[PDB]
């Protein structure tokens, strides 16, 4: 049950013209190339390579009109000759600070349909995450995994290195209602707002006699978010004094993972509203991100409410 | 400059009989098999498989007399017919809690020469880490890496998946004198001793106007220790109220990484003495572990001194 | 320029509904699995495995109604629930006698559209090769190659083991007008007809002072035919006293390679008519096969004419 | 039961100083690199690359004094600083005419000990094949295989692409006493001597009512010789009018395969004496080669005797 076969079958079921199917295949081919490069990087700038692979694969798919990448200042408008209806926002390599120590790193993407009647522009990439058509990530960890949703839940696929294809390993994954792990960079504690300080105190010093949550923070958002999906708990990169609007990027970091987490029955908030409901105003806009098991995110939101 | 060629060349230089060379090759062959299994695990109990691979490879090398594994209650005495002079302590798969979320995991080992004149027994595995002949780890991360020392510094090798061999990527690596990352499970904060609480407070709320250290904690000791080696900083798993003697295991977790870190110019302490100077009293003995950049470990030791 | 991307792009250009595209992808996925098994066969009945992979991949593609395999006595009718419009004739593993000595082996296939209005049956697989929609082969040699035509010439793709995908290496390949290699099992010389004896004598003892042709015969038809395509010359498995109708099978050996060779500007004959014009009367029908560079096949046909 | 472990174990049993063991490992590492290059050649002069890999690997092993390669006019004398006792004759890539059509190709080698007391020179590479210390070949076919003998029979190993190591698949292989396949380029029939013409006639037109032998000729000597080993029969590249001393090269083609075939219980002759007994007079000397199942080679020798 390979990913390409799965994607083509889902396309058949959806009665699609093949356009999204070609796009997804092109994205996944880029991911396979990136995986191979990551697995031999030290022997063989990974941002630049990954970015080129994704842009070229996507543009040549005849399915795109606008791309937004972390690595490009401006939106990339597809040549008229190759122009299709989809807009792709992506982070070609997430976790760059973890490349050299061989920690898990990733690729993140969200796909939208152009709905405007205008000439294609950056504005077509400023849709709310609620309008996502498909989104997901690749995790280049101890094994290579893709999480993908096209709106009917989250499916996990793993690269079979012998076969050279991604194979379905879990269909329609659901996050636990409550976890026992909290994940954030506590090195920013001095800069936290009151709500974040209070929540973290609740995790480490519970007042109901429960065991403190365990702490984990890989420092690669895709790795920490994937763990949150499969083990439950909470991941936070809130606003702080040094990053008053948060650090993570709305279009190509936060919206894709918020989509996956919500699809799996979790929550993803800025602290004031769901990430997927934020209307983007600029392509490299930052937002706070708190996501994971719904009961844990709900508890964080109570801390925000109590301190507002 | 492949690992097997490198190991055989080092053997030639050492005027060895070939015994340690055969042992190291056998260990590294087990590591390659484990890597392959890890990279396809979700599709294809990893503790049990890895343990069997290592025991079989080591015993059949004709270089061992005693093995200690995390996965075996008692020391494993090699059959007389296959008996050599070396004692190997190993953790066949480190980071088991991180297997399912695809975070970096590893294999850890230390090799000793039997120095007693007695029949081989568990006592031959109770040498201080100072007596290590060779030690190191494999990290199954975004790429596969081996760190190895035979007493002349730390060398890093990376698996070339196309060639099917480990290749030298860095010779004689040295840790930074001081880093900017601290790494420990802060979920145990409620249970910390005063020295640990004070040190962590110093990292998050410096009193000299310096920037707080960043926090990272993968939760797989090999991954966190490897990051500490290549980026600098400090890794801690101190004793706490729930684990009054620490959690990590002296023979096959702490001594091997202490050896690597000291070889790279770092420090590794229990809080009261160097890990490598602890005389083991039992094969599955636990010890506290604080290691990394020497100035950072020295600062931790000042906190211990101040609170004793 | 990967095969999956290439096939999807050709589908887009053809304005296809995606049905043939899904079929081709499914076939090529089976080929990748077979390649992997072949490359580790001695360590790890290859007919049975390959056959199962192909049948399962094809049926689950929702693109087929009838399959004919060398390994199945009767045509395989696709379940109504999974039924599409295409008929696939295939040899899941060609060159079985060469498996154990590690010579090049292969997979061969031809795809037809069902044109009858009747319930699907073996009769839908009895079209002349002229009615082929797509055909080709995989060659599991020193590298893994696919030759594929959908009617616009022959394209060659090679498996990149690092990427895990087939990549285009040659577009629209054309056979040489005349070659210098002849390829047949001369162990059947005692049983040859007069025309074959005369032709072979002309190749070994030319009467115009030209150099004799070189002889090559791997004994795996896909390997010998592929060499004929890329180097030129002639390949023969004519009728003989022991095999009066030839040995090779019309539906899933001869028609697919005849299609590739004709598409590349060569000829493929039974000795009396083009292979592609033979009307099949039974699914496992045998025919004589003589193919390759047009001037060489034309010379063979002159020998047939002269001896009729 | 991996090749490196096997070679080191055989070294231990032989009480070797490790010198031959290091040499063999270096040769086998070159073979693994060549295999990888061959498997991706079309995408990625193969003679030149393979030659460089072998020379560099061998020289840096500290085990050699003299190398002879097909690709170098003169013997290559190892720098005094890296000088060991062994002489290696090799064909870094055998079957160059078959590279582009993806037929099986190979690497061939024979190892000798320097026995002279003189400064090392080409003369040290002019030993008779009887003096071989170790010899064998790699076959880059549908899978990758090494045949190796160090004087205690022929062992076959196959590359496990997942593990990245050669694994033992057959120990102490013996050729059949008589086969049913004959293998030679019959395109040279016009130039054959009387004995070769008579023998080939006996294979195609037996005079005792037996079935004619089947014909096979890949045209890559390593592939044809390997088939001869595992299936039995006979392989010939005799002298002919265009090549009065034969075509194949004594030092690095004929002696290595003659050694393997004799070790497996077969015969290898020039037509007048065993190949292994020929005293080489020049490093690129050619000899006729007829080898395989002993009863078949004996029959060929009767034809030589009858026509002398
Ligand atoms: N491969 C696929 N998987 C899931 N949904 C799809 C797929 N292809 C198309 N769809 C759905 O059908 C719509 C139209 O597809 P298309 O005609 O390819 O643009 C898309 O926007 C998706 O919502
Ligand atoms: N491959 C090697 N690399 C580094 N040191 C070695 C190697 N082989 C042997 N030695 C050193 O030489 C000693 C004796 O080797 P052996 O005779 O193989 O037990 C070992 O305990 C090591 O200290
Ligand atoms: N991927 C493709 N490559 C080449 N030709 C195609 C492809 N898909 C469809 N076609 C052509 O279009 C016809 C209809 O395609 P379909 O609607 O998928 O059955 C096929 O029978 C082919 O002749
Ligand atoms: N790995 C090995 N396998 C088989 N025979 C070996 C091996 N190593 C050494 N020998 C035999 O022992 C001799 C001396 O080995 P060395 O001291 O390494 O030159 C060689 O010439 C071989 O005949
Ligand atoms: O590491 P990142 O900024 O995608
Ligand atoms: O995960 P660990 O106990 O080696
Ligand atoms: O070897 P074959 O009968 O496909
Ligand atoms: O193809 P060859 O001359 O080794
Ligand atoms: Cl990680
Ligand atoms: Cl072949
Ligand atoms: Mg990035
Ligand atoms: Mg990122
Ligand atoms: Mg970045
Ligand atoms: Mg463990
Ligand atoms: Mg452990
Ligand atoms: Mg454990
Ligand atoms: Mg077959
Ligand atoms: Mg066949
Ligand atoms: Mg068959
Ligand atoms: Mg050659
Ligand atoms: Mg050759
Ligand atoms: Mg040559
Ligand atoms: Zn990013
Ligand atoms: Zn452990
Ligand atoms: Zn067949
Ligand atoms: Zn050669």
For the record, the structure tokens of A267 come out as 């929550």
Give the strand order in the sheet containing D181-183: D214-215, D181-183, D234-237, D289-292, D267-269
Question: Collapsing DSSP states into helix, strand and coil, what is residue B201?
Answer: helix
Which residue pairs, CB below 8 angstroms and at least 24 apart, start in A189-192?
Answer: A189/B204, A189/B205, A189/B212, A190/A241, A190/B204, A190/B205, A190/B212, A191/A240, A191/A241, A191/A242, A191/A243, A192/A238, A192/A240
Tell whether D161 is within 8 A of chain A (Cβ).
yes
Measure the CA–CA gap between D6 and C291, rounded to whole angstroms. 47
Helix/strand number for chain B, H first, E second: 7, 13
Cβ–Cβ gap D62/B9 under 8 Å: yes
B11 lines ligand 2 (CB under 6 A): yes
Which residue pairs, CB below 8 angstroms and at least 24 apart, start in B7-15?
Answer: B8/D18, B8/D21, B8/D22, B8/D25, B9/D22, B9/D62, B10/B150, B11/D18, B12/D18, B12/D22, B12/D62, B14/B150
Any residues with CB less than 8 A from the CB of B250 and at least 6 apart, and which?
B275, B278, B280, B285, B286, B287
Q: Is the dihedral of CA B199, B201, B203, B209 positive or negative?
A: negative
Is D91 marked within a binding site? Answer: yes
For the record, the structure tokens of C86 come out as 């295409």
Cα angle, residue B103 at apex, residues A175 and A240 outer, rounded to 5°: 70
Tell whether D45 is within 8 A of chain C (Cβ).
no
Q: What residues in B contact D165, CB-CB < 8 Å?
A: 29, 32, 164
DSSP code at position B131 = G
DSSP track, B88-107: EEEEEEE-GGGTTTT--EEE
In chain D, ranges of CATH 3.30.540.10 domains: 1-173
In chain C, ranges of CATH 3.40.190.80 domains: 174-307
Contacts A–D by Cβ distance under 8 A: 3
Point out residues after which chain D has a gap (C–N over 2.5 Å). 44
Find the length of chain C: 308
User: Which CA distances in Å does A6 have to A22, A143, A171, A221, B211?
Assistant: 13, 20, 11, 27, 49
Helix ranges, chain A (H): 3-13, 19-39, 46-59, 194-204, 221-231, 255-263, 294-307
Cβ–Cβ gap B189/A167 under 8 Å: no
Measure the CA–CA gap between B16 and B116, rounded to whole angstroms. 20
Q: Is the dihedral of CA C176, C179, C185, C190 positive or negative?
A: positive
Instruction: Work out the number of other CB atoms within 10 angstroms of the CB of residue C82.
Output: 14
List the single residue in C with minimal CA-CA distance to B160.
C162
E strand or H helix at A105, and its extent?
A: strand A105-113
Torsion of CA C157, D222, A164, D168, to 10 degrees: 170
Any residues with CB less than 8 A from the CB of B206 and at least 6 apart, and which?
B212
Measure the CA–CA gap between A9 and A95, rounded to whole angstroms. 32
Measure the CA–CA gap between A303 and A306, rounded to whole angstroms. 5
Beta bridge partners of D137: D108, D147
Cβ(B77)–Cβ(B114) under 8 Å?
Answer: no
E strand or H helix at B33, and its extent?
A: helix B19-39
Cβ(B214)–Cβ(A187) under 8 Å?
Answer: yes
DSSP track, C77-131: EPPGGGB-SEEEEEEEEE-GGGTTTT--EEEEEEEEE---SSPP-GGGG---GGG
Any residues with CB less than 8 A from the CB of A136 and at least 6 apart, and which?
A108, A109, A146, A147, A148, A149, A154, A256, A260
Cα angle, residue C298 at apex, residues C295 and C301 outer, rounded to 5°: 155
For the record, the structure tokens of C2 come out as 């990967």
Helix ranges, chain C (H): 3-13, 19-39, 46-59, 194-204, 221-231, 255-263, 294-307
Measure the CA–CA gap between D277 and C23, rounded to whole angstroms. 59
Any residues with CB less than 8 A from the CB of D206 and at least 6 apart, and which?
D212
Cβ(A145)–Cβ(B42) under 8 Å?
Answer: yes
- Produce one character per residue of B34-67: b if its CB has 16 or more CB atoms within 10 Å, e if not: bbbbbbbbbbeebbebbbebbbebbbbbbbbbbb
Measure the CA–CA gap between A225 and A262, rounded to whole angstroms. 12
For the record, the structure tokens of B30 come out as 């087990």
Measure the CA–CA gap between A183 and B216, rounded to whole angstroms. 10
Torsion of CA B193, B196, B197, B198, to 10 degrees: 120
Tell whether C140 is within 8 A of chain D (Cβ).
yes
Residue C236 CA to ligand 8 center (angstroms) comes to 27
Cβ(B65)–Cβ(B84) under 8 Å?
Answer: yes
Cβ(A161)–Cβ(A214) under 8 Å?
Answer: no
Residue B95 CA to ligand 6 center (angstroms) comes to 5
Side-chain half-sphere of D308: how many Cα atoms within 13 Å? 9
Beta bridge partners of C139: C106, C145
Is D247 marked within a binding site? Answer: yes
What is the largest distance, in Å, between two alpha-carbon atoms of chain C? 65
Measure the CA–CA gap between C108 and C31, rounded to whole angstroms. 10
Burial of D258 (0-12, 13-18, 19+ CB in 10 A): buried
* Radius of gyration in angstroms for the set of CA atoms belonging to chain A, rounded to a whole number: 19
For the record, the structure tokens of D271 come out as 């037509």
Which subunits sit against C, judged by 3+ Cβ pairs under 8 A? Answer: A, B, D
Determination technique for this entry: X-ray
Helix, strand, coil abundance in chain B, percent, nearest 5: 40, 25, 35
- Give me the helix-helix angle, C19-39 and C46-59, nearest 10°: 160
Question: Collapsing DSSP states into helix, strand and coil, what is residue D304?
Answer: helix
Measure the CA–CA gap between B278 and B258, rounded to whole angstroms. 11
DSSP track, D221-235: HHHHHHHHHHH--EE
Any residues with CB less than 8 A from the CB of A57 and at least 6 apart, and which?
A26, A27, A29, A30, C5
Burial of A281 (0-12, 13-18, 19+ CB in 10 A): exposed
Residue position matching structure tokens 């590794």: B268
Cβ(B87)–Cβ(B124) under 8 Å?
Answer: yes
Measure the CA–CA gap between B287 and D195, rounded to whole angstroms. 81
CATH of segment(s) D174-307: 3.40.190.80
* Radius of gyration in angstroms for the set of CA atoms belonging to chain D, rounded to a whole number: 19
Q: What is the number of the ligand 6 atom nearest to the C-alpha of B97?
A: 1
E strand or H helix at D236, and its extent?
A: strand D234-237
Q: How far apart are the first and last CA of chain B?
A: 49
Measure the CA–CA gap between C301 and C273, rounded to whole angstroms. 10
Question: Collapsing DSSP states into helix, strand and coil, what is residue D148?
Answer: strand
Tell whether C143 is within 8 A of chain D (Cβ).
yes
Measure the CA–CA gap between C30 and C136, rounded to whole angstroms. 14
Cβ(D86)–Cβ(D20) under 8 Å?
Answer: yes
Q: How far apart are the first and last CA of chain A?
A: 49
Which of B40, B141, B205 is closest, CB to CB, to A103? B141
Closest to A125 measured CA to CA, from A23, A260, A252, A277: A252
Measure the CA–CA gap between A131 and A137, rounded to whole angstroms. 17
Cβ(A192)–Cβ(A244) under 8 Å?
Answer: no
Question: Collapsing DSSP states into helix, strand and coil, what is residue B270?
Answer: coil
Cβ(A257)–Cβ(A264) under 8 Å?
Answer: no
For the record, the structure tokens of D244 come out as 């009065």
Measure the CA–CA gap between C95 and C158, rounded to whole angstroms. 20
CATH of segment(s) B1-173: 3.30.540.10
Atom 7 (ligand 2) nearest CA = B11
Cβ(D31)–Cβ(D159) under 8 Å?
Answer: no
E strand or H helix at B56, and its extent?
A: helix B46-59
Measure the CA–CA gap between C87 and C110, rounded to whole angstroms. 8
Measure the CA–CA gap between C96 and C74, rounded to whole angstroms. 21
Residue position matching structure tokens 């190339």: A33
Measure the CA–CA gap between D47 and D96, rounded to whole angstroms. 8
Cβ(D261)–Cβ(D229) under 8 Å?
Answer: yes
In whole angstroms, what separates CA D157 from the centre of its chain?
Answer: 15
Closest to A203 measured CA to CA, from B198, B188, B97: B188
Q: Is the dihedral of CA B216, B218, B219, B223 positive or negative?
A: negative
Measure the CA–CA gap between A27 and A61, rounded to whole angstroms. 9
Tell whether C104 is within 8 A of chain A (Cβ).
no
Cβ(C288)–Cβ(C242) under 8 Å?
Answer: no
Measure the CA–CA gap between A237 and A241, rounded to whole angstroms. 12
Find the length of chain A: 308
Residue position matching structure tokens 């070939």: B18
Measure the CA–CA gap between B272 and C47, rounded to whole angstroms. 66
Cβ(B202)–Cβ(B35) under 8 Å?
Answer: no
Cβ–Cβ gap B163/D11 under 8 Å: no
Instruction: Work out the number of other CB atoms within 10 angstroms of the CB of residue D69.
Output: 25
Helix ranges, chain D (H): 3-13, 19-39, 46-59, 194-204, 221-231, 255-263, 294-307
φ, ψ for residue D110 (rounded to 5)? -135, 140
Cβ(C20)–Cβ(C109) under 8 Å?
Answer: no
Cβ(D136)–Cβ(D7) under 8 Å?
Answer: no
φ, ψ for residue C24 (rounded to 5)? -60, -45
Instruction: Work out the number of other CB atoms within 10 angstroms of the CB of residue D56.
Output: 12
For the record, the structure tokens of D270 come out as 């020039």
Cβ(C95)–Cβ(C55) under 8 Å?
Answer: no
Which residue pairs, CB below 8 angstroms and at least 24 apart, start in C283-286?
Answer: C283/C68, C283/C74, C283/C75, C283/C89, C283/C122, C283/C125, C283/C126, C283/C251, C284/C70, C284/C249, C284/C251, C285/C245, C285/C249, C285/C250, C285/C251, C286/C243, C286/C245, C286/C246, C286/C247, C286/C248, C286/C249, C286/C250
List the single residue in A with minimal CA-CA distance to B184.
A215
Q: Which of C1, C143, C164 to mutate to test the interface with A (most CBs of A within 10 A)?
A: C164
Give the strand order in the sheet containing A181-183: A214-215, A181-183, A234-237, A289-292, A267-269
Measure the CA–CA gap between A289 and A240, rounded to whole angstroms. 12
Any residues with CB less than 8 A from the CB of A64 and at least 6 apart, and which?
A23, A58, A78, A82, A83, A84, A86, A87, A88
Look at strands B289-292 and B267-269 and give their pairing: antiparallel
Look at strands C289-292 and D64-69 and give their pairing: unpaired
Reported resolution in A?
1.6
For the record, the structure tokens of A245 come out as 């609007």
For the record, the structure tokens of B64 come out as 């061992």
């Amino acid at each position: 049950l390979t990913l390409t076969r799965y994607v083509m079958e889902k396309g058949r079921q959806a009665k699609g013209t093949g356009e999204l199917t070609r796009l997804l295949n092109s994205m996944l081919t880029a991911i396979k190339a990136i995986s191979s490069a990551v697995r031999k990087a030290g022997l063989a700038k990974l941002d630049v390579l990954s970015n080129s692979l994704v842009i070229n694969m996507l543009q040549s798919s005849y399915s795109t009109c606008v791309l937004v990448s972390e690595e490009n200042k401006d939106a990339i408008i597809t040549a008229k000759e190759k122009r299709g209806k989809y807009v792709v926002c992506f982070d070609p390599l997430d976790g760059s600070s973890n490349i050299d120590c061989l920690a898990s790193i990733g690729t993140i993407f969200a796909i939208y349909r152009k709905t405007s009647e205008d000439e294609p522009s950056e504005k077509d990439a400023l849709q709310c995450g609620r309008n996502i058509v498909a989104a997901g990530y690749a995790l280049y960890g101890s094994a290579t995994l893709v999480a993908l949703s096209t709106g009917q839940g989250v499916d996990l696929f793993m690269l079979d290195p012998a076969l050279g294809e991604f194979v379905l390993v879990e269909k329609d994954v659901k996050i636990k209602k409550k976890g026992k792990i909290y994940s954030l960079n506590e090195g920013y504690a001095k800069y936290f707002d009151a709500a974040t300080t209070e929540y973290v105190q609740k995790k480490k010093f519970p007042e109901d006699g429960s065991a403190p949550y365990g702490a984990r923070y890989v420092g690669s958002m895709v790795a920490d978010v994937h763990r949150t999906l499969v083990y439950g708990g909470i991941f936070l990169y809130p606003a702080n004094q040094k990053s008053p609007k948060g650090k993570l990027r709305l279009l190509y970091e936060c919206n894709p993972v918020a989509y996956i987490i919500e699809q799996a029955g979790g929550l993803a908030t800025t602290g004031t509203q769901p990430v997927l409901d934020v209307k983007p105003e600029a392509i490299h806009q930052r937002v706070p991100l708190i996501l994971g098991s719904p009961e844990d995110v709900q508890e964080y939101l109570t801390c925000v409410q109590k301190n507002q």
